């Protein structure tokens, strides 16, 4: 039931997810860092990469980890 389907430390990878009027929107950024321990105190703006017409009442999320 892939009823909707779509295909396409030293760096900080950032994302923003929101879900409005049946569209799930993804913004993102990749940037280098020097504080290996934590988020940098400077400024940069994320930019849109995806918009998914998926129509789901999302209330929870989880994240996926690679195992050897």
């Amino acid at each position: 039931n892939c009823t909707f389907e779509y295909v396409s430390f030293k760096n900080l990878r950032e994302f923003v997810f929101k879900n409005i009027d049946g569209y799930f929107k993804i913004y993102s950024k990749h940037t280098p860092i020097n504080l290996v321990r934590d988020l940098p105190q400077g400024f940069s703006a994320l930019e849109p990469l995806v918009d998914l017409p998926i129509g789901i009442n999302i209330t929870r999320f989880q994240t996926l980890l690679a195992l050897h």
Partner: peptide, 23 residues
């Protein structure tokens, strides 16, 4: 008769219980 056509935020989808076939 045909009973294959059925009813129960903007553009949300949702695939006693609210199933009603039209006749």
């Amino acid at each position: 008769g045909n009973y294959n056509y059925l009813y129960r935020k903007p553009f949300e989808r949702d695939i006693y219980f609210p199933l009603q076939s039209y006749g």
